[PDB]
Design a protein around this motif. Structure first.
Motif, short mmCIF file in Angstrom:
data_model
loop_
_atom_site.label_atom_id
_atom_site.label_comp_id
_atom_site.label_asym_id
_atom_site.label_seq_id
_atom_site.Cartn_x
_atom_site.Cartn_y
_atom_site.Cartn_z
N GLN A 73 0.40 -1.20 -0.01
CA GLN A 73 -0.01 -0.13 -0.04
C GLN A 73 0.74 1.71 -0.12
O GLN A 73 0.51 2.28 -0.24
CB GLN A 73 -0.75 0.13 1.36
N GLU A 113 -3.97 -6.93 -1.91
CA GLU A 113 -4.83 -6.54 -1.38
C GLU A 113 -5.73 -5.43 -2.46
O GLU A 113 -4.90 -4.98 -3.48
CB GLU A 113 -4.98 -5.11 0.35
N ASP A 128 -4.95 -9.81 1.39
CA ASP A 128 -3.95 -9.85 2.22
C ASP A 128 -2.65 -10.48 2.86
O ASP A 128 -3.68 -11.49 3.38
CB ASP A 128 -3.83 -7.34 2.23
#
Ligand code: GTP
Ligand code: GTP
Ligand code: GDP
Ligand code: GDP
Ligand code: MG
Ligand code: MG
Lengths: 24, 429, 431, 117, 44, 426, 440
Positions: free
Chosen positions: G11, G71, G98
């Motif tokens: 992320q 994810e 994830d």
């Protein structure tokens, strides 16, 4: 695109046109 | 008075010949209709070397297009110069070879060879004093490797004391275009080593490098590699069709080049090739041709001449030039590089100069190099052959066509003796 | 000249041939009613006295439904009514019914029509067989056709374009029996056998194309593209021309090992060609990627033995040379000891033809890859294990003994395929 | 297959200039010379005759997938200078710990250069 | 200004903002290709 | 006649050679497009020293541009004079050296040295009587230093009798531009001692000092720094390209300045440099030229000559100037400084005068000096090298490509022997 | 040539690459539709985009960057946002579940899940490279896929590619603030395996950039977007020598030779000098000597550690814009005459310098002011060893009772690698102690 004002990545990464730097 | 009958075998031979005849006709001012609309007068004096005369001012080439299946001739006839051939000289059958040497030599080549030689005799008896023949073929495919060698074998018996020239496209070291190439290459080399007088081995990747490094053409076509081959093919017969201050036909090059009868595999070249953007940075004199013919990266055979020794070297210069500079450069190259020339021949360079250059050019030269650095071209094919043959890799498509296991072994022995002979003459004191 | 006769057997054969002949008609100027509003069509069409072009095809099925669908559809005026042969009852997933009891009463009529299609032949290059390994007629009658075609027409090329049983997806319970029997009887009478399976094309249609839930038509169009790329040199101009006889002398080293694979290189949807270039180097290496194969096997767990490169479109010979030279340097692609030369290269100019209602993209270049690999011995061992599960206590054998077939035909087919497995294993060992 | 040498044109055909930016197969630098013809060592179907010796390397290649790759694979560069002798011994024990990765078609090609203290 | 080319007789253009370089010397299949230049530094 | 094959390696070599060819092409009146536009006959007569004859009255340099990454020659080609070089002379690889001597000398430098040897063979065997080679590079870089040393070693075994010059850039004392600079400097001097004929040591700090104090340049660029080096380069071979009362080529300066074969490191200088407001205050006389040539604030290396003794001095003058004045200024300089010149050579100054000056200058002179103050330049590199090699600071980036650890010991032994040999004559 | 391939994993990696690629499209003329504006020139034009953009036969440009996550949530705003048409669809790889802040989920079960696809995509992207410098990895130490999957990715990259340069960019664990509670475990386990496989690990942390945006820029309450923009400015300054003309070029290989002296000390700290607001640029100069000193200020560091607490082993100054090299030499010379800044004995040189002419650009809506000069400082210091001490204490506090371990041992990992990784980090601490001792 309503994500311009709803998500952080939308307000962060949306296209504002660049301005030409050096004045005439 | 020294005319040449041209033979084209297979699709490689036909694609080479369709460009070669355009080159020759552009040299001699022949339109695609067959008539003459040239400029000078020397373009007719020896125009009978390649062209026959017909009633009506039409010139017909002495070409015999041979293939086992008429697919390629449909593309040849639709080309830029497909109408100039006599329709009777096209010989074909009904079934293709399928890249099989046996299918082009024994099974399906027997019913075509009688009519091919009928056309050959027809085109060789209309000659007054026949100089010799030519053959364009490739040693990888099936009809160009099997049918063409059959033509050479049964022409040498018919005409024993005429010259016989072959422009063979021997296979590729890096990437092949045919999985069965070692078999056809070894067998066709075995046929060529007893039958032809000169051979001009030409590799495809050597042409690719020439095209990309020297000419720097960004996108090769096959019509440019055929142009590069046909420039050298139409460079060894310029002393037959144009006046010279030192003439050299095929016979004189044959006498001066080969020292022994089984060593007649050469390395072609072309001197004044240069890039499109590098013309303003270069001059065109005799040293600039000399430094280009003897460069290793100018050969069309893809074998390093610095890995062996030169036995004999030809040089057929075209244009207006001085014999002093040409002879001085030929001596200078031999003197400055003494390791790459055999010591037991005092002069390894044969010189010939014509007057008429190729059109749109100052000077040109054609390199014909007999070198002992051709032996690894045979060594690689022999060891690919022994990689395949001992396992019977693809042999059932040959033994199933009436062949024998003895022919492959005879071909391998005949090529290994050639390798041994070249190695013996390389290291001789 | 350069003429080929197509034989379609069974439902899979007819439904593949529908897409194949649509592609053939649209690739030439052949209207669906047989008119042309040039004689490049002579490889597949024959011109009559009424200005009507008739395909060189025999549609054969032992069940009327699919051939009657052909007869009612848009292409009814194109096909000569006797070309579409029809039986009355099908084999019903039985190899013995399509080989001994039902198919023996339709074989002579099909051979009569084949001979009547071989007299409009000036030079016959060979036949093309379209059938499936799992069906009844598509195994039994398609194998019955080979033993008579080989003895009647001699040594001509007889290509078969088979549909392989997938490792996971299958329709028939009894289909390992059909596959093993039809492989045992076709082993001598076939020259080359281009094999694809339905599951790999399902995976390509899901992953490369953006098509969740595709049907059989989408697979048939891809197979028709393969067939059009195989015989594209007999109808169009070519820098390097390939005939049908050139495939069997390059892809088939040994008389038993005639099972190559098939791969179409730029299989991408219309929205993905905007985002990438499709140069020759970018479509040559995609053929050797395991995610683009059309048989569900991993070639990296085996060895390569032959490769046929069928380029098609705006290509350059040096681009092909460099792209193939790059592949020989890769550690993942590993060839065999007794093949030091690898490749057969074909080049054609005419780009592939876009079909309206198809799912592909208007490409500028395309490659069709035909590789003979040792990794297919997984599929043979898997099918062998599947047969060994059922035959161990004689399941579904009574349906085969009762239809003119001796029970000992299963056993000898099984040990001959054991010999085939040892054949595939013993060509990978070096010395 | 065997990669041969374009003896004067091997520079464009070397794998780094062909946009192959990974580890690649070696190219032969010279070709041996043999005389005479070759005996047939294999019968039909490709089987080796019992009199000839085979190779103990298994067929179907030597390929190492993701799940067959060991966890904690050894270093790629693996230099040894400015190292304690015990630590360099640990690093070379780590390199020689898994021999199956060193003899796969795709795998590790480590060079152990230098000496520790 | 027609000044002699001597050490010190150079004056930079401070209003120039783009300093992009081109790839004149690139590559090809295996060959060190060399292209004739069409633009200077910055794209002019 | 007597031609020079110019060679350039590395980013420093290319960026200095571009300005050098700029100065040379101005001196002979060559167009940016490559044609001839000079206004005198003397500009054509000896144009074959550096240039090659092309068609249409066009002249191309004999330069060989060498780099392991074409990032710098790409910027060279986009300049005002980037289209005069032959496109076949550019040599580039795919991966750079990364300021590593071993990458430029053993592993990535070996895949490219053949294609440079072919080009220099083409540009050397096409010569009437080749005089010598020139190399422009830097001793602090990876591909410059390493590939230049490999190129010199390959050239010297092919032409073991011609001149080989090196206008190298030795590292600065105060601020280094590379962390691993003394390793490369030591490993390159070990080859330069044993393989070159002359070597002109230039520090960027001295050029900064010149451009700050002498020239009064508030914001100098690297082009202005390379202009001085190019002027020094052009002032040495001025007798080859123009006539004179007393001519001196490269070999004449080689004989008259190198008493022993291992002492061939020089400090250069350019004489007529003035501030931006002081030209109206100067009288253009010869004693001003000879006084500013010998000044310690005019040397291009960071070692003033008061730390040693002048072994020999070369002073190549350009312009219409009298012989008696030049000779008496040389004699006065030698006599008024007894301690700074060696007593076993009676005349420590070799002179040469050419008529044609640089355009825009009435007189000019180039200082070439062999001094025993150059050994303190090697001592700085030696102690910076032994401050790192004692603890093996960056050795794993040098032994990772296969170098032995005894190479550094041999290089530092040769450096210490050179320092001791220079100390022998002081 | 000079191509670089970016790999954004996690992320943090994706939200950094968004800012980085918006920046990259702003340096050149590339628009979010994937094309430049129209031709402006007869025939050829600029080719500076080939460092990062691959261009097809028509005029569309594709980034050379693989976006990876386990994810689907974070990547889907790139698929629907402004830059949906710029990226190739197959360049944005997602999973379905994830790693859930678990190292072993991202390394042993879901790590080996997707590593083949991104390897194939890397191979396809590296096949367009005429000249390839090295790979760039963007990840965070505290993540599950940013720590587990990045480690396996560089592991297989070193297996398949050999000695290709792998410059990784990391978000270090901040000393005080943190998000996860299993974060020291992930940092320990992602240092243990990539101690060798990373050539040089450029590092920043969130807390120091928070302090920078508080004091230097005049923004109360920064968010992750300003941090990502500053990191993108750092990455643009690092690779600017491959795209723009300069007086002293630098390749990606020179950093690993001028910054990594020993085979385990490859964790330098980034610094960006003239990060000031537009309301404060009106008053002060931005001179070379003024902002060279601002690099060595402890408060301007992008890692929350004191350079006074250690010794500077090496430096890599990357100047940019209208910089005169004489002022560069004067500033670096006057840096070495200070007692606050201390250097090790075995590095008498210390500095590697680079000069580029192209000034930094202005992102519309950004925070930084338009300046003519910029320095990106890469410092390898011994003062990082006090961060490893804090990290080791944080691991040892909850490893004594063996807490949050059943999520790791229970799922695809033994226990012995915990002890082994602790031994490795303790050995690294002793190495940092050894290299900081003067050989007097
Ligand atoms: N590629 C493709 N395969 C098909 C198609 N239709 C059927 N098949 C395959 O054919 C196999 C079954 O055999 P069929 O062709 O349907 O039937 P058959 O061969 O005529 O045998 P019978 O039904 O007993 O008459 C299935 O396993 C399918 O994989 C199709 O449209 N495309
Ligand atoms: N600089 C910066 N750091 C971020 C950003 N987003 C998350 N982080 C850092 O990343 C850490 C958490 O790791 P992540 O990268 O978010 O987690 P992940 O890679 O998605 O791994 P999983 O969540 O387990 O799937 C936090 O402590 C943050 O400090 C960001 O946008 N910018
Ligand atoms: N130079 C050149 N070679 C060709 C051409 N066409 C085919 N070839 C070569 O022919 C070889 C294969 O031979 P093939 O065409 O099968 O011979 P065939 O039996 O007559 O069909 C390949 O290695 C090609 O390089 C051409 O136009 N020019
Ligand atoms: N005086 C001067 N020095 C330069 C110039 N360009 C580069 N350098 C020096 O070169 C050194 C860097 O080495 P470099 O040549 O870039 O390494 P290379 O590219 O591998 O040859 C630095 O110490 C610079 O001082 C220049 O134009 N003038
Ligand atoms: Mg049915
Ligand atoms: Mg996450």
């Amino acid at each position: 695109w309503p994500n311009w004002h709803l998500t952080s990545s939308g307000v962060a990464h949306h296209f504002i046109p660049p301005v030409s730097f050096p004045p005439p | 008075m020294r005319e040449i009958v041209h033979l084209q075998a297979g699709q490689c031979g036909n694609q080479i010949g369709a460009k070669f005849w355009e080159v020759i006709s552009d040299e001699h001012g022949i339109d695609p209709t067959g008539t003459y609309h040239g400029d000078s007068d020397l373009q007719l004096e020896r125009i009978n070397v390649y062209y026959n005369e017909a009633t009506g001012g039409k010139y017909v080439p002495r070409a015999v297009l041979v293939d086992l299946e008429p697919g390629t001739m449909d593309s040849v006839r639709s080309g830029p110069f497909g109408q100039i051939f006599r329709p009777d000289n096209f010989v074909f059958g009904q079934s293709g070879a399928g890249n099989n040497w046996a299918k082009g030599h024994y099974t399906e080549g027997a019913e075509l060879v009688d009519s091919v030689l009928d056309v050959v005799r027809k085109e060789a008896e209309s000659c007054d004093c026949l100089q010799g023949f030519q053959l364009t073929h490739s040693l990888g495919g099936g009809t160009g490797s099997g049918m063409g060698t059959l033509l050479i074998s049964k022409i040498r018996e018919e005409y024993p004391d005429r010259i016989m020239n072959t422009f063979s496209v021997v296979p590729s070291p890096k990437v092949s275009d045919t999985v069965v190439e070692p078999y056809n290459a070894t067998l066709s080399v075995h046929q060529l080593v007893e039958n032809t007088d000169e051979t001009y081995c030409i590799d495809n990747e050597a042409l690719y490098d020439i095209c990309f490094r020297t000419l720097k053409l960004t996108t090769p076509t096959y019509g440019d590699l055929n142009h590069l081959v046909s420039a050298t093919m139409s460079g060894v017969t310029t002393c037959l069709r144009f006046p010279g201050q030192l003439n050299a036909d095929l016979r004189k090059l044959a006498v001066n080049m080969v020292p022994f009868p089984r060593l007649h595999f050469f390395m072609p070249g072309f001197a004044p090739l240069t890039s499109r953007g590098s013309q303003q940075y270069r001059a065109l004199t005799v040293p600039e041709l000399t430094q280009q013919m003897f460069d290793a990266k100018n050969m069309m055979a893809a074998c390093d001449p610095r890995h062996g020794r030169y036995l004999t070297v030809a040089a057929v210069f075209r244009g207006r030039m001085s014999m002093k500079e040409v002879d001085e450069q030929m001596l200078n190259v031999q003197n400055k590089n003494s390791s790459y020339f055999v010591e037991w021949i005092p002069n390894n360079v044969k010189t010939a100069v014509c007057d008429i250059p190729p059109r749109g050019l100052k000077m040109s030269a054609t390199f014909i190099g007999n070198s002992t650095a051709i032996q690894e071209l045979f060594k690689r094919i022999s060891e690919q052959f022994t990689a395949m043959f001992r396992r019977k890799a693809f042999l059932h498509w040959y033994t199933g066509e009436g062949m024998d296991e003895m022919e492959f072994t005879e071909a391998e022995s005949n090529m290994n003796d050639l390798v041994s002979e070249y190695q013996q003459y390389q290291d001789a004191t | 000249m350069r003429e080929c006769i197509s034989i379609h057997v069974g439902q899979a054969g007819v439904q593949i041939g529908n897409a194949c002949w649509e592609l053939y008609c649209l690739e030439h100027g052949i209207q669906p009613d047989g008119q042309m509003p040039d004689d490049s069509f002579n490889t597949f069409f024959s011109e009559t006295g009424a200005g009507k072009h008739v395909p060189r095809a025999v549609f054969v099925d032992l069940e009327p439904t699919v051939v009657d669908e052909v007869r009612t559809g848009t292409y009814r005026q194109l096909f000569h009514p006797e070309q579409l042969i029809t039986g009355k009852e099908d084999a019903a997933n039985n190899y013995a019914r399509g080989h001994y009891t039902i198919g023996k009463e339709i074989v002579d009529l099909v051979l009569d029509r084949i001979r009547k299609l071989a007299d409009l032949c000036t030079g016959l290059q060979g036949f093309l067989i379209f059938h499936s390994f799992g069906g009844g007629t598509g195994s039994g009658f398609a194998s019955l056709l080979m033993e008579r075609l080989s003895v009647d027409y001699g040594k001509k090329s007889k290509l078969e374009f088979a549909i392989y049983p997938a490792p996971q997806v299958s329709t028939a319970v009894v289909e390992p029996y059909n596959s093993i029997l039809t492989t045992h009887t076709t082993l001598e009478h076939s020259d080359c056998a281009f094999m694809v399976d339905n599951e790999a094309i399902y995976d390509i249609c899901r992953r490369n194309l953006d098509i969740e839930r595709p049907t059989y038509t989408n697979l048939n169009r891809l197979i028709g593209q393969i067939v059009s790329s195989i015989t594209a040199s007999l109808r169009f101009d070519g820098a390097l021309n390939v005939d049908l006889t050139e495939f069997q002398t390059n892809l088939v080293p040994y008389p038993r090992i005639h099972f190559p694979l098939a791969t179409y290189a730029p299989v991408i949807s219309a929205e993905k060609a905007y985002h990438e270039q499709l140069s020759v180097a970018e479509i040559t290496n995609a053929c050797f990627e395991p995610a683009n194969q059309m048989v569900k096997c991993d070639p990296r767990h085996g060895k390569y033995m032959a490769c046929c490169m069928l380029y098609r479109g705006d290509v350059v010979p040096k681009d092909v040379n460099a792209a193939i030279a790059t592949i020989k340097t890769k550690r993942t692609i590993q060839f065999v000891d007794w093949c030091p030369t690898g490749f057969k290269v074909g080049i054609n100019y005419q780009p592939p033809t876009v079909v309206p209602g198809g799912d592909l993209a208007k490409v500028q270049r395309a490659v069709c890859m035909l590789s003979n690999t040792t990794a297919i011995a997984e599929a043979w061992a898997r099918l062998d294990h599947k047969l060994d599960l059922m035959y161990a206590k004689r399941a579904f054998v009574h349906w085969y003994v009762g239809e003119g077939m001796e029970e000992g035909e299963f056993s000898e087919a099984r040990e001959d395929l054991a010999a085939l497995e040892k054949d595939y294993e013993e060509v990978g060992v070096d010395s | 297959a065997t990669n041969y040498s374009a003896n004067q044109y091997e520079k464009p055909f070397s794998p780094k200039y062909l946009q192959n930016w990974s580890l690649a197969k070696p190219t032969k630098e010279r070709i041996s010379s043999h005389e005479g013809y070759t005996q047939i060592i294999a019968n039909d179907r490709g089987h080796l005759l019992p009199s000839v010796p085979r190779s103990k390397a298994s067929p179907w290649g030597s390929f190492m997938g993701t799940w067959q790759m060991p966890l904690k694979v050894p270093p790629a560069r693996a230099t040894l200078t400015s190292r304690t002798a015990a630590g360099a011994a640990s690093l070379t024990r780590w390199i020689q710990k898994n021999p199956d990765l060193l003899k796969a078609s795709n795998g590790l090609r480590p060079e152990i250069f230098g000496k520790p203290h | 200004h027609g000044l002699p080319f001597l050490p010190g007789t150079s004056f930079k253009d401070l209003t120039k903002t783009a300093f992009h370089r081109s790839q004149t010397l690139g590559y090809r299949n295996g060959y060190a290709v060399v292209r004739r230049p069409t633009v200077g530094i910055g794209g002019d």
